[PDB]
């Protein structure tokens, strides 16, 4: 057991000749809700062709297997406002438009997650900038629902004993981690046509099922004589994906981060007349 | 001939002498919950026959200016026979459905309807960033009207037909299970919808399993006849329904 | 305990080794080598099979 | 040997598993000894009973009163003894119990629960009680007729002084959030007089009951989080 | 163990496949359940029919009119019913269809296409139509005599209310660009009156036709790109 | 021998029907100190259910297998006070609250330790900051009990010949090391209800058994023209853990780092009355 | 001298290799794959076994 | 299957002696378009020689297997002109002369590509330069044809959800990636003697077939108090190469990046007379 | 796993041979076709005749 | 699953191991060990073979 060993082309085209019979493949009835299965070989003479094309790149695994930004935020190393020196982001996947659209083509999903963090820093403009500061360090902390939440940069809550955390230093490769399928159902749900209270009242929509927790970031101990601003970008990359119940892609522009609200939009563009082809 | 269909559930029967085949959800027939997939501990109740039967909801009137209608399930059957009582008295429920939509007209009428069941048909408010009560989207068995023009009342859902109140192209609804009622060659559409959800069971008062939509793509037309409208009727029948978690009536 | 397997390549005209280092299956790399598919679920959801040659009704 | 560093190098993840050098090579550890009472899973703790402070009346001058449910003779017919929400990780009643403490270190939970009631009255006293569990709904029960519809057990007081109500796991989802909300409600538990308490001459006119909470053998938790009950402002 | 880092170390490539540590060791995932309707390839979606808004007349007060092609009685002989370019990913007609949306996530495409037409007139109405596909050329057809030279099918309206025109894959290259240009043109599709529509007394004088678009079983796409239809200016 | 090869679901639910017999599983007697073992199948009719849930995440190994801050301190590269240019921390695990609580749920523990150090630097504010300084280097030294202790940054004791030490440079990954079970007993003890002297006098409590040594940190040779402040955080991560004699979790807030002293606290919160459920 | 073993994964619907590089057992990675447990120590510490069906006393 | 196992010298010279016969290897006829195949052994006496020379270094794989710059561009971290803070380069291989020439010796090519990016930064000159800025980070994004194009540094399009991207930090090794044969034909074409429209009108030349997409680069969040300029160089390195239909190397200097236009050039240099050999 | 970086790490050598990640996973390449005239070594070109401009008379 | 093969070296007067880590064949290293060649395509494209010794015409 030092080793252990472990492709699907599209359909070919078969030669067809002249025909004259009672069979009518072309004629059908869409009223049944059944899409036809005719092929070009059934309506005109065709030669024999061997197709080596493959549909590898259209698998859901590959379609969703690309990292995408889902959130970015800024925090300063030193400032008067306490709330401005750290970030607190409730986790959700509906704030950036492209990744949201991509996900919203399926009603239910089940996958592992790969998270990557990109952090950059810059010196704020000012009258006096001459200073020398060693390399900075950052802390990322994940707080499952119901856990304590810090209220300031130097709060006791930053002494994580059970909450996973990452300490990262500038100049190295971006931080990364993997998370398993952390849901309470048998699959994640992009849509939820229901209410919170059993009396059909309360919050309505997917917001109701969003209880993934929070993420907090801060400078470990950096406190410069002059302000320094940092930005963090979060990237998600699904793995081992399964999807169910496809739905039509969205057409109207997004307008709210926790709702389906929209404005009516034309079906498509227009042209001069039904015959114009130029 | 394959143009004749007969369906017998419980103590009710449906016979259509001119119809197309029956569509079956995503190729899955309704069935009971398996032992290795359940989560609740106590014994379920399975009142077949008493609940698995056809229930004809009320009827609508199809005019030359109609735009469409929708119903939401299972809330539509909230007060229909023993099904409603069982749903009231239980915390959890589970059941598939058989939807049959009838519409008949002479050989000289023309028109086309789209019948489609949309699971998790979440809808947006008429005015962005404004909440609405649970009355502009489901109030029992009564049907709701789509609107040709853009909606404006904040108390109601956006009824713009071409967007289907979901922010998606109306022409793309074909992806869901569906059928067409074409007056040339059809009189009814039959759809068998299995139980689709992210959990084995769910409360039927808090969650709308799926939405039924009827949209006239080709408006009704006729000339020189005494009939002014074409009635439309909808019939539903739960299949393999089982409840759990008995408690006080809601 | 190493796995050997083929890698995408052309057609008319080739093995890589993989080893898992972590004790959680969520850490494995993406398994993007599966190509099985079946569209009959969405294209032919009817109850009675229909032959293309025969009339629909 | 050519190599390429992938993203994530040089990161410090607090929940990683990697080998690292030993700072005390060839250190001789003390021989092991089998101390009694080894514990290998927090669930073992979670299945032990603990007293539930049900009597949170906002007027408890004496703290110990929280653990005793009053009962009287000549009680109106069909009266409510107590009622509470079934939120083991959030409700004040179960918040600090031996079970509640364990859950607060996690985010998801599932399984059944056991509620045990013990009658600590006199030996000559007698009575019957109805204990019912009502699954989630629009309104909690208000009268015994409403309560008796749901899961319940009729408790008879005799030589055996304890009765167990097993709360079944009825839920639409495989798991429930510890920080429960409207979506993942769990229901209510209430107790009512079935017959009333009768006593002979020369006995106290009042008695008390105690409740114990524990998890069944199918209980489990998931996702570790940091508890919110303990906090500090300055280094000790 | 001597080693040398090759170029590319410490880079973050958004489409890489590497193992990384798990932040929640020994996490117990919820058991899987076979929900109906699993999808394993976007082509499965791409092969489903969808209505094509062919009637883009720049004067559509009512949006739903875009899906209905007018037809009249007593029509001049051999008249054109409609015409369009075959650019499934670029032309406004196919831009937003269920098929067009999928292609817009890719750069290359190949394979045949299906166009299905359904007559939604009266039961007593009758007629014949000629539907032709013209490969790329210097000029699109202007009269039925020109159209009938290329691939075409004569459609007869009867009990079967639907007819399918299969557009064959004729191209000099194995693939075509979604952002089509002069080099990779695909041709035109047009429909003409073959005999005309005849109706008996007491029937409407006008009818409508609808078109459905879908991909054959040899269709495929390649190279993933980000779609251009959706955009934002500020964080939501 | 090139290779060598090497799961436990919760109990299921069995179907149960109507019953009428002399057996009374519900009735018991807690006076015995024995917790019941009834199941829902013993009091109401139930269906057959197969449970695939597992208790993997609740093992003591996983419960304690998370790194947590246990101490943080600051030291300056250059300053007038000698004692302010280096750190001297007696090792103990009772200074940060969360990790302390977590550990205090068991009376005795036995585990290996994984230690990680996070170090960050920042330039102190001042009137003149224009300077150029190469990357800094730090030294961490561990002094078992009874060894010599440095008295200043440039003391001879920093020439470790037997004391393990780590030299670290900013910009790289955090330092790390592993330590074996270094106790004098067969297990560590979080509590000790006893005295030091055999006459029942002297120190009382766990302090008595705390003899793990000290940790010292300093800048190797950095001495800037202007002050630079650095902070160090220490993280502990038990491995191969075994625990004995569980005890109830603490309820009252901690107040001393080497004592169990506390202030009385209410058992729990209150509500309107015994019947209020809203 | 490599060890191969299974990794956590789902249920209804998978091997990693490990090698030790250091000469001290304390350097090994956490052995978080053990799931054996027994609660009878704390739940049934009585001397005489009691059958649930039978009366307690 | 733990392992699996898996050279061509030039022709030798054969000894030849005096000859006198009717065979005339020297005489031939180039009119046939057939190059001779005579050898020195056929015209003068030769000794036996064993040649160990090999033609390994002249294979097309090795000839083209060298990375070469194909494009360089500059962008500033902060400036008034929005278009000057990022780069947008349509991909093509005809802008740098040497690599262009090398490729243009074959009509058709088919290969995989290895791309490497070299990024450097420098502070722009100015009156005040005293500032402190942490390490910078850069983003490279690839946009296949037809995708959305950003219009400013902070556009929404930079939240790639399907477009591959690389985030890189200064001080590390250069970024790298590999791309497969991404063409729509069975081979890439350096030349195309044809038009775009079927009426023999429109664009003419290889430009017509250039539809590989675009590349965009920007500073992630760096925004300095004073301008900082960065430069990026792109290197391509073909792999697994196949070539067809060789053509003579170019002689006239290049003058346009998307055309074959040139100016007439002398065939070669001159000398005093036909007999001069000094 | 202890390791030590040797000199030359993090260098970019224009004539190196190393594996690198693919930016388009599971991409389906177009099928190959045998175009006439494949060339596999520049010497094949070098052995073809060509006219030599011998008459370089500066006039 | 490792490949062993010879490496260029001198003449008169030697094995390296390779393993593939990625699932796409495009990630492999350059296969610059092929030395087969045939110039007759460009040097002798005539229809009738001509013997060098014999006269061309
Ligand atoms: C409303 N649903 C929300 C979840 N969304 C899928 C999803 C689920 C979880 C996550 N991330 C979970 C997570 C994992 C690890 C962390 F550190 C923080 C986190 F929030 C991302 C996307 C589908 C739509
Ligand atoms: C009172 N007991 C003190 C020990 N504590 C467990 C414990 C023991 C040793 C350690 N660390 C030992 C150590 C190991 C390596 C060092 F470099 C320095 C050290 F102090 C940490 C926690 C349990 C409570
Ligand atoms: C006109 N032809 C253009 C293509 N050229 C060969 C070629 C093809 C593609 C590429 N690069 C493709 C590519 C690959 C990956 C990217 F991120 C961006 C890209 F543009 C480079 C050279 C031959 C001449």
Cα-flanking dihedrals φ and ψ of residue F69, to 5°? -60, 140
Closest atom of ligand 1 to CA, residue A212: 20
C-alpha span between D133 and D150 (Å, rounded): 6
A273 HSE (CA, 13 A, CB side): 6
Bridge partners (DSSP) listed for residue F121: F230
Interchain pair D3, E6: CB under 8 A: yes
Q: At D92, list the tokens.
A: 């004040």
* Strand positions, DSSP E, chain D: 2-3, 12-13, 38-39, 50-51, 69-72, 80-85, 106-110, 113-119, 128-134, 151-156, 162-167, 176-177, 188-193, 206-215, 220-224
- The answer to whether F217 and F139 are in contact (CB under 8 A) is yes
How far is it, in rounded angstroms, from Cα E63 to Cα A252? 15
Residue partners of C49: CB distance under 8 A and separation at least 6: none
Q: Where are the alpha helices (DSSP H) in E87-192?
A: 92-95, 98-103, 144-147
Residue ranges of G 9-38 with Cβ closer than 8 A to chain E? 9-13, 30, 32-33
Using a 6 Å cutoff on CB, does residue F175 contact ligand 2? no
Is C7 in contact with J1 (Cβ distance < 8 A)?
A: no
Note whether B248 contacts F: Cβ–Cβ < 8 A.
no
Burial class (CB in 10 A: 0-12, 13-18, 19+), C56: buried
Phi, psi angle pair for F157, to nearest 5°: -60, -20
Backbone angles phi, psi at F232, to 5 degrees: -125, 135
User: Which CA distances in Å does B127 have to A11, B102, B131, B154?
Assistant: 49, 35, 8, 5
End-to-end CA distance of chain J: 59
CA-based torsion, A194, A198, A204, A207: positive or negative? negative
Whether the Cβ atoms of residue A193 and residue D178 lie closer than 8 Å to each other: no
Cβ <8 Å between B175 and A246: yes
Q: Which two tokens stand for residue B15?
A: 């016979």
CA angle H153, H158, H159 (to 5 degrees): 145
CA atoms within 13 A on the CB side of E191: 21
Across the interface, of I26, I27, I32, the residue whose CB is closest to C12 is I32
* Centroid of ligand 1 to alpha carbon of H172 (angstroms): 31
E172: Cβ contacts below 8 Å, ≥ 6 apart = none
Contact between B231 and D204 under an 8 Å Cβ cutoff? The reply is no
Among residues 18-57 of chain C, which lie with CB inside 8 Å of chain J?
A: 18, 29, 32-33
Partner residues linked to D190 by β-bridges: D83, D132
Secondary structure (3-state) at B100: strand
D26 near G24, Cβ under 8 Å?
A: yes
Residue in chain C closest to J23 (alpha carbons) equals C7
CA dist., res. E152 & res. E165, Å (int): 8
Q: Does E34 touch chain F (CB under 8 A)?
A: no
Q: How many angstroms separate the CA atoms of B139 and B134, rounded?
A: 8
Q: How far apart are CA F39 and CA F49, in angstroms?
A: 13
CA distance A140 to A175: 10
What kind and span of H or E run contains B101? strand B90-102
Residue identifier of the C-alpha nearest atom 13 of ligand 2 = F212
Ligand 2 touching residue F113 (CB < 6 A)? yes
Residue H26: CA count within 13 A, CB half-sphere? 7
The answer to whether the CB atoms of B162 and A192 lie below 8 A apart is no
CA atoms of B103 and B19, how far apart (whole Å):
11
Task: Give dist(CA A33, CA H184) in Å, integer.
Answer: 35
CB F78 within 8 A of CB F129: no
Whether residue F57 and residue E31 make contact (CB cut-off 8 A), yes or no, is no
Instruction: State how far the Cα of A273 lies from the Cα of E143, in Å rounded to an integer.
Output: 17
- DSSP at A171: T
B161: helix, coil or strand? helix
Q: Which of B127, B120, B26, B20 is nearest to B72 (CA)?
A: B120
Pairing of strands B188-193, B23-24: parallel
**Alpha-helix residue ranges (DSSP H) falling in F30-186:** 60-64, 97-103
F110/H24 Cα distance (integer angstroms)? 97
Under DSSP, is residue A49 helix (H, G, I), strand (E, B) or coil? strand
Q: Where are the beta strands (DSSP E) in H170-227?
A: 175-179, 188-189, 195-197, 201-204, 214-219
Residues from chain A contacting residue H2 (CB–CB below 8 Å)? 2-3
E-chain CB neighbours of G8 within 8 Å are 26-29
Mark yes or no for CB contact B42/F49 under 8 Å: no
Q: Tell me the three state secondary structure of residue D209.
A: strand
Give the number of the ligand closest to the Cα of residue H102: 3
Q: What is the maximum span of chain J, computed from C-alpha positions, in angstroms?
A: 59
Are chains F and J touching, using the cut-off of 8 Å on CB pairs and a minimum of 3 such pairs? no
Identify whether the C-beta of residue E110 lies closer than 8 Å to the C-beta of residue E174.
Answer: yes
B216 close to B68: Cβ distance less than 8 angstroms:
yes
Ligand 3 neighbourhood includes H143 CB (under 6 angstroms): no
D21–chain G nearest CA distance, Å: 6
Q: Which residues of F196-229 are buried (b: 16+ CB within 10 A; e: fewer)?
A: eeeeeeeeebbeebbebbbbbbbbeebebebebb
- In DSSP terms, E212 is beta-bridged to E51, E116
Counting atoms of ligand 2 from 1, which one is nearest the CA of F213? Answer: 20
Q: Does the beta carbon of A247 lie under 8 angstroms from any beta carbon of chain B?
A: yes
């Amino acid at each position: 057991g030092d080793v252990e060993e472990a492709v699907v082309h599209v359909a070919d085209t078969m030669r067809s000749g002249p025909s004259n019979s009672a069979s009518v493949p072309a004629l059908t009835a869409v009223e049944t809700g059944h899409t036809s299965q005719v092929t070009p070989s059934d309506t005109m003479q065709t030669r024999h062709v061997k197709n080596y094309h493959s549909r590898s790149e259209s698998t859901v695994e590959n379609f969703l297997g690309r990292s995408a930004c889902v959130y970015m935020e800024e925090y300063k190393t030193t400032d008067n406002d306490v709330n401005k020196k750290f970030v607190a982001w409730p986790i959700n996947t509906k704030q950036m438009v492209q990744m949201r659209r991509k996900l919203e083509m399926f009603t239910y999903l089940r996958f592992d997650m790969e998270v990557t963090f990109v952090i950059t820093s810059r010196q704020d403009p000012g009258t006096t900038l001459a200073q020398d500061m060693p390399v900075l360090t950052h802390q990322i902390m994940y707080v499952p629902p119901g856990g304590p939440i810090p209220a300031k940069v130097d709060d006791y809550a930053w002494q994580t004993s059970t909450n996973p955390s990452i300490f990262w230093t500038e100049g190295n490769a971006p931080a990364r981690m993997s998370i398993p399928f952390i849901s309470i159902g048998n699959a994640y749900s992009n849509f939820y046509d229901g209410w919170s209270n059993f009396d059909q009242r309360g919050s309505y929509g997917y917001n109701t099922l969003n209880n993934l927790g929070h993420i907090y970031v801060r400078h470990v101990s950096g406190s410069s004589p002059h302000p320094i601003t940092s930005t963090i970008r979060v990237y998600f990359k699904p793995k081992h994906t399964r999807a169910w119940v496809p739905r039509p892609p969205r057409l109207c522009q997004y307008k709210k981060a926790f709702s389906v609200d929209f404005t009516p939009t034309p079906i498509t563009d227009t042209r001069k007349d039904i015959n114009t082809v130029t | 001939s394959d143009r004749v269909r007969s369906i017998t559930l419980g103590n009710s029967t449906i016979t259509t002498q001119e119809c197309a085949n029956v569509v079956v959800g995503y190729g899955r027939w309704p069935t009971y919950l398996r032992d290795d997939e359940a989560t609740a501990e106590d014994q379920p109740t399975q009142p077949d026959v008493a609940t698995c039967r056809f229930y004809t909801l009320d009827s609508i009137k199809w005019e030359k200016g109609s735009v469409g209608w929708w119903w939401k399930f299972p809330e539509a059957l909230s007060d229909m026979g023993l099904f409603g009582q069982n749903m009231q008295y239980h915390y959890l429920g589970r059941a598939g459905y058989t939807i049959h939509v009838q519409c008949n007209a002479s050989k000289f009428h023309q028109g086309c309807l789209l019948v489609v069941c949309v699971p998790e048909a979440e809808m947006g408010g008429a005015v962005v960033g404004q909440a609405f009560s649970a009355t502009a989207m489901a109030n029992g068995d009564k049907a709701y009207e789509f609107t040709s023009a853009t909606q404006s009342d904040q108390t109601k859902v956006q009824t713009a037909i071409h967007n289907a109140g979901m922010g998606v192209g109306v022409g793309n609804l074909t992806i869901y299970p569906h059928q067409w009622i074409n007056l040339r060659t059809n009189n009814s559409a039959t759809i068998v919808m299995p139980y689709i959800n992210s959990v084995p069971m769910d409360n039927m008062f808090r969650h709308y399993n799926f939405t039924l939509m009827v949209i006239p793509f080709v408006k009704l037309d006729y000339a020189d006849t005494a009939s002014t409208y074409v009635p439309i009727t909808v019939t539903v029948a739960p299949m393999c329904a089982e409840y759990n978690g008995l408690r006080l009536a809601q | 305990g190493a796995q050997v397997s083929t890698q995408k390549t052309g057609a008319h005209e080739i093995h890589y080794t993989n080893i898992n280092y972590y004790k959680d299956a969520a850490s494995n790399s993406a398994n993007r080598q599966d190509f099985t598919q079946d569209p009959s679920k969405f294209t032919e959801p009817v109850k009675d099979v229909m032959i293309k040659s025969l009339p629909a009704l | 040997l050519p190599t390429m560093n992938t993203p994530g190098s040089t990161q410090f993840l607090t929940s990683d598993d990697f080998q690292s050098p030993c700072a005390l090579p060839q250190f001789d550890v003390t021989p092991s000894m089998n101390i009694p009472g080894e514990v290998k899973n927090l669930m073992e703790i979670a299945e032990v009973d603990s007293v539930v402070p049900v009597n949170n009346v906002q007027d408890t001058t004496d703290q110990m009163e929280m653990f005793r449910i009053p009962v009287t003779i000549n009680a109106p017919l069909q009266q409510q003894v107590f009622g509470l929400r079934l939120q083991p990780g959030l409700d004040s009643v179960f918040k600090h119990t031996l079970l509640g403490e364990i859950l607060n270190y996690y985010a998801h939970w599932s399984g059944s629960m056991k509620l045990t009631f013990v009658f600590c009255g006199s030996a000559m006293a007698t009575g019957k009680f109805l204990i019912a569990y009502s699954p989630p709904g629009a309104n909690p029960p208000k009268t015994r007729k409403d309560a008796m519809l749901g899961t319940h057990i009729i408790w008879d007081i005799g030589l055996q002084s304890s009765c167990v109500l097993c709360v079944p796991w009825i839920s639409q989802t495989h798991y429930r959030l510890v920080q429960q909300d409207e979506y993942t409600s769990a229901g209510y538990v209430t107790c009512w007089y079935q017959t009333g308490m009768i006593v002979p001459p020369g006995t106290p006119n009042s008695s008390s009951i105690m409740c114990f909470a524990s998890a069944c053998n199918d209980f489990s938790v998931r996702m570790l989080r940091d508890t919110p009950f303990i906090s500090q402002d300055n280094k000790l």
